[PDB]
Amino acid sequence: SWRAQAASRLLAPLKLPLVLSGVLAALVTLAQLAPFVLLVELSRLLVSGAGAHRLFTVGFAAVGLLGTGALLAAALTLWLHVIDARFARALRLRLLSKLSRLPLGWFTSRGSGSIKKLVTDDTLALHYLVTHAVPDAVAAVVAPVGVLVYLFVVDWRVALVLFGPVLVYLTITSSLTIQSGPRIVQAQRWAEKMNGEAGSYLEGQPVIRVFGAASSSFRRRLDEYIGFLVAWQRPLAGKKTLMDLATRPATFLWLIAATGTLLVATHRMDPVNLLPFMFLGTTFGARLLGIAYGLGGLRTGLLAARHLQVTLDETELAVREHPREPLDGEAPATVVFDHVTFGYRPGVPVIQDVSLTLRPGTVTALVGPSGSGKSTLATLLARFHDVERGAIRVGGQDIRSLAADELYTRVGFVLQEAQLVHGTAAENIALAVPDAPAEQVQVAAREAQIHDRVLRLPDGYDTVLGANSGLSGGERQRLTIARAILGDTPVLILDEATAFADPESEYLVQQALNRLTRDRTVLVIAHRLHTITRADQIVVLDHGRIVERGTHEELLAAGGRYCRLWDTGQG
Amino acid sequence: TWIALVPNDHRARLIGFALLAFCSVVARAVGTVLLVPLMAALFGEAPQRAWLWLGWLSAATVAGWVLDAVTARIGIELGFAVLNHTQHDVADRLPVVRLDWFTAENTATARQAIAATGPELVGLVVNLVTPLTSAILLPAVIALALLPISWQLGVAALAGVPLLLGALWASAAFARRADTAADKANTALTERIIEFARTQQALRAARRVEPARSLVGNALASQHTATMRLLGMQIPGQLLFSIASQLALIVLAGTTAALTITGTLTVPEAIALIVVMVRYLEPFTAVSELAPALESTRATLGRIGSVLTAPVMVAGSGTWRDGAVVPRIEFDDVAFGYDGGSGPVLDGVSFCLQPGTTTAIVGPSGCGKSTILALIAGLHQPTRGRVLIDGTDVATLDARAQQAVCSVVFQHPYLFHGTIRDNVFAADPGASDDQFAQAVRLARVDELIARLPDGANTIVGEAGSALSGGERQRVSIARALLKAAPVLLVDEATSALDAENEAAVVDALAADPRSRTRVIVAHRLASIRHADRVLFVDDGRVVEDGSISELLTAGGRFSQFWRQQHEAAEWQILAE
Ligand SMILES: Nc1ncnc2c1ncn2[C@@H]1O[C@H](COP(=O)(O)OP(=O)(O)O)[C@@H](O)[C@H]1O
Ligand SMILES: Nc1ncnc2c1ncn2[C@@H]1O[C@H](COP(=O)(O)OP(=O)(O)O)[C@@H](O)[C@H]1O
Ligand SMILES: [Mg+2]
């Protein structure tokens, strides 16, 4: 990656606060380091005369440095937190405004865990980045540089003889990293697999508790995992300890002591000019490790910001493209299809040139082998994704040329995923029409076979819902069916799988549907094709395009694929 | 409590490693005490008499090198040992954790603790234990060794150690508290967004997207109210220790200067002591540089802590003399509420079943109907009651033998990552392929094993694997028929648009030599018609414990269920 890359560089509006904070952190770190120079100056004084006044001066200087360091650190923390809070608020507003505009299909493509992960996890990770990683890394990179400059200013020979351990450490670590190529990716793959193993073992717990001999597989996989970990780590242990030895302050201490004793005994060192190394020379080994630590640490936040930005710069709906001026076919609910071709990926197309027209008051059905673009078509009809070629009009008026309000004003649908918005059960039934006069809600709930249950609820038509509401799948589906009945939109979409979702509470849902589809242009995604025998127009489709449409009796009297699906068990 | 336990049987290795670490520490400490005379000589009129002390320091250095090399080797060994032991212990102690503990997040916790803690432990041994302990112990022994050289300055370090350690720990605690407050506030903030994004379809479909959006945005812009406590309690987490360290340095240097200005130790000694003071103060910063690693490891091992310190169900005490060829499952005055998400579901039910007689359970959905098939299998514990399989309790059983009485056909089937044959052979590993063939033929699944490539052996575990719904439910049925146990609990699985599954269930019900007591919660009339003692469970209590022929023509709610099933299988969407 690089700069000016607007797929990871969404954190551009705070580049100037970031550089000012970097400068402030560099100043804070130099103020942290200064006490050692003050100590060296104190020693230089003490070694020759230096009446009490001169030492008191150094004490006052040290107190001043402590004070200004603490003050600068506090200022830096406050400023960073302020700018981070402001940016996070702006980002939350931007993300919500974006989320209010993505096409519905995206949601039932990501899911629920991914949504939460993205929003809260990435927001927290980016906030942690801005508040901790950047200043800590700036400090970790600015401290060793300063120490090194100060050391070379004092005496350019002890620094050279001190480089040794750093050199051998670099040598051994390069050897190890080029000597572990396969094992690292192998262990990564092992981890990704063992995650699935753990998931499956935790899922199938009753099966393990009843059939106790079905645990063998996971235990063997875990044994192989730990054996691989051992056979990986155990060999490169001597190399690791021999390379971790040339970081110990003992080694740098011995080096410095030896070279200083050599230079002083030969009277070419001015021993008072050796104390800087003695003080800030042993931890130079750990300084570079800290460099690597921080520079690696500022990576999770970066990748999180990149993912959040590639989410933000999504492609919203083309909506309102130059109104089609509704044609003269018919404009009640006569929905007509066209040469429609659509694919989830820019490659393989799932749908190909359907072009089927529904009439007002007709019931059409879709029948294909499960996984043959059977639901994708009805899903497209409700503007979950834009088509790639061809048009789709509701009343001879292209759906893309329709406001998101005007569209769903007439294309109400009942798919899976009841999707209860937690609130007043009465208001949750009357979500469609904002304020029904408390009687429409009741009669709709009575005509959706849910009134008795919602009265059996603890309180009644005020009960705030939730995870612990107690409602079952059938109960929630009937609530949403009541809401759709109250909606009263004269074009409907039935996912027939909603009927036989709760196999016990199924007759009541069937009655609710029979009441819901009394006057519509229902488009049924029929799974069990016996429920579609009096439908006005059957449409079988397989692997995309339509093959043949008609009524049940005719299509059965003309043999292809439908006599096939019919004779299969049903005869 | 029990978080990371070494084998705890071979005390020798542990005590040897401990004394070896202590020896490395005392060598690293005598390093600076040997620095003292060297630096004292390097300033006097005769700096040529420091070669002896340099040689002694070199001796101490090579001793420390050998010592800590051996210590690192022992550390890596013990790390492998502890990884192996604790991973086996964690994976061993999860058939016994009480089943209602696996909540929505307690499951993710255990998943992480199982599949994310290898490298964490193999580094936890050395990278955590040895530096943290050595750097803590080093200042104390430094002071102890500094007592003979200069008493008034030795006790100063011994007074300093507790204060600096307390300051360090207080800074760490402040940091942790500020961080948890921060991310808690962040979650409180960005939960409404998750809520508005979950229900984005119903809102959009009901033309209520802009008011909800404006409401959430108004709330966001309204609350604000940050800073003050957050910023105020986030500040100290580094200033505390930074101040404390610089202050200790100032105080020690001032003490040394005061004692070399009053004429108690000549100028060269004061310089050496000033150097030794920085040597003494270094390990505290070395420890303070280990705060984030320690916190990460603390969380990672808190995962294992939560896993191991989970509740356990025990029955034990030994029973099951012979085998009770055909038992009789009665359990009277029983109640069982789900600990966690409470509510007295299934309170006070009682029914004595019969040996070898199918007993179908039928009722409204979500009425505590699979909890009964759990309690019968002994997979759960009744709060106030007693399951009485064959006139004996089920909690008076050695766990190894209480799982050899039932065989369940669980609602949601689970096939672990292996092959179909291995799944079917999970019931009785020591079976013969003839019994396996009989089962795979009786479960209406031979056509499935012959309707796939390469035969029976097939990667089936996950990722579709060509297995879909009824296709794997029939494998589960074939597996539950192999385990010879004198009880067969069959909780129906939803298998719409598939009649082979229902036919296999009817076959398991009718044609079976075993002649075992069976319990089949089902709804479909075909499955329900082959029983002879039906229970109607409505809201955690049996209502119509009669029989088909007498429940139809006499009572209610069951003519209701019967007519609903009979006229719900002929509902076709008319073109009206
Ligand atoms: N979220 C998705 N991402 C990518 N491809 C998908 C997604 N959902 C479905 N598909 C694919 O689109 C095609 C249409 O499937 P679908 O219309 O759901 O089938 P059916 O209606 O028969 O159940 C299939 O190839 C399916 O795998
Ligand atoms: N793990 C659980 N934690 C809390 N409540 C649960 C749990 N499992 C089931 N329940 C609840 O216990 C009741 C009994 O459900 P159950 O008998 O399994 O229903 P079903 O007849 O559909 O199998 C229901 O209200 C259900 O929501
Ligand atoms: Mg069930």
DSSP string, B76-107: HHHHHHHHHHHHHHHHHSSSSB-GGG--TTHH
Host H or E run for residue A383: none
CB neighbours (10 Å) of residue A139?
18
**Which residues of chain B make contact with A420, given a CB cutoff of 8 A?**
199, 202
Neighbours of A389 (CB within 10 A): 12
Contacts of A180 (CB under 8 A, 6+ apart): A236
| A198 vs A186: CA distance, rounded Å | 18
Asked whether B312 and B97 are in contact (CB, 8 A), the reply is yes
Which amino acid appears at position A77 of this protein?
Answer: T
Residues in B closer than 8 angstroms to A283, CB to CB, are 282, 285-286
The ranges assigned to domains in chain B are 11-309, 329-568
- How far is the CA of B33 from the CAs of A284, B142, B361, in angstroms? 22, 8, 83
How far is Cα A540 from Cα A365, in angstroms, rounded to an integer? 8
Mutate to test the interface with B, among A480, A507, A536, A553 (most CBs of B within 10 A): A507
Rounded CA gap, B415 and B479, in Å?
10
**Calpha distance A10→B508 (Å, rounded):** 62
* Contact residues on chain B for A286, CB-CB shorter than 8 A: 286, 289
Task: Give the containing element (helix H, strand E) for A353.
Answer: none
Phi and psi, residue A458, nearest 5°: -45, -55
Name beta bridge partners: B332. Answer: B386
Q: Could you say which of 3.40.640.10, 1.20.1050.10, 3.40.228.10, 3.40.50.300 is the CATH number of the domain covering B329-568?
A: 3.40.50.300
B-proximal residues of A, 117-156, CB under 8 Å: 119-120, 123-124, 127
Cα gap B288→B495, rounded to integer Å: 60
The answer to whether B250 contacts chain A (CB < 8 Å) is yes
Query: Which residues of chain A from 174 to 193 reach within 8 Å of chain B, CB to CB?
Result: 191
Please tell me whether B364 is known to bind a ligand. Answer: yes
Instruction: Say yes or no: CB of residue A393 within 6 Å of ligand 1.
Output: no
> Residue A521 in contact with residue A333, Cβ under 8 Å?
yes
Top-tier CATH class for B11-309: mainly alpha
Q: Decide: A142 and A26 in contact? Cβ < 8 Å.
A: yes
Residue of minimum CA distance from atom 8 in ligand 1? A109
Which residue on chain B is closest to A429 by alpha carbon?
B206
Residue B567: CB partners within 8 Å, gap ≥ 6? A507
CA-based torsion, A415, A417, A418, A424: positive or negative: negative
Closest residue by Cα to residue B122 from A231, A239, A285, A217: A231
Q: What tokens does B389 get?
A: 């399989």
- A528 and B496 within 8 Å at the Cβ level: the answer is yes
Measured CA to CA, the distance from residue A277 to residue B543 in angstroms comes to 89
Token pair for A167: 């050199």
Of B494, B548, B484, nearest to B516 by C-alpha is B484
Pocket lining: A428 vs ligand 1, CB cutoff 6 Å: no
- Cross-chain CB nearest to B496 (options A195, A206, A527): A527
On the question of a common fold for B11-309 and B329-568, the answer reads: no
CB A293 within 8 A of CB A360: no
Q: How far apart are CA B140 and CA B146, in angstroms?
A: 10
Q: What is the DSSP letter of A503?
A: S
SS3 B244: helix
Residue with CA at minimum distance from ligand 1 atom 23: A371
With contact defined as beta carbons under 8 Å apart, do B533 and B361 qualify?
Answer: no
| Phi, psi torsion values for B227, nearest 5 degrees | 40, -135
Scan residues 74-103 of A and list those with Cβ closer than 8 Å to B.
74, 77-78, 81-82, 85, 89, 92-93, 95-97, 99-100
Decide: B370 in ligand 2 pocket, CB within 6 A.
yes
Give the dihedral sign, CA A399/A401/A404/A405: negative
| The two three-digit tokens of residue A227, written as one number | 């054996």
CA distances from B348 to A173, B62, B372, B537 (A): 69, 77, 12, 12
Which alpha helices (DSSP H) does B444-533 contain, by range? 446-449, 470-482, 499-510, 525-528
Residue type at A237 in one-letter notation: A
Which regions of B337-392 does DSSP assign to beta strands (E)?
Answer: 347-352, 359-362, 386-389
Q: How far is B12 from chain A (nearest CA, A)?
A: 22
Q: Contact B341/B44 with Cβ under 8 angstroms?
A: no
* Eight-state DSSP code of residue B343: -
| Helices A15-46 and A52-99, packing angle to 10 deg | 170
Q: Is A282 on the interface with B (CB under 8 A)?
A: yes
- Among A444, A438, A476, A439, smallest CA distance to A457 is for A476
State the Cα–Cα distance between residues A394 and B290, nearest whole angstrom: 65
Determined by cryo-EM
* β-strand partners of B351: B331
Taking contacts as CB-CB distances below 8 angstroms, the residues of chain A near B203 are: 421
Which residue is it, tokens 């966001």?
B220
Nearest chain A Cα distance for residue B1, angstroms = 23
DSSP state of B310: S
CATH T-level topology, domain A15-313: Rossmann fold (3.40.50)
**Per DSSP, which regions of A19-170 are E strands?**
none
Ligand 1 site-directed mutation target among A342, A348, A370, A372, most atoms within 8 Å of CB = A372
Ligand 1 atom at minimal distance to the Cα of residue A108: 1
- Show the tokens assigned to B63: 């001793």
Q: Does residue B537 come out as left (phi exceeding 0), alpha (psi in the -120 to 50 range) or beta?
A: beta
Check residue B206 and report its DSSP letter: T
Cα separations in angstroms, B50 against A277, B57, B271: 18, 11, 15
Asked if A502 reaches chain B (Cβ–Cβ under 8 Å), the answer is yes
Q: CA separation (Å) from B136 to A245, B35, B172?
A: 19, 21, 15
Is the distance from CB of A74 to CB of B240 less than 8 angstroms? no
DSSP one-letter string for B46-78: -GGGGHHHHHHHHHHHHHHHHHHHHHHHHHHHH
Ligand in nearest proximity to the CA of A369: 1
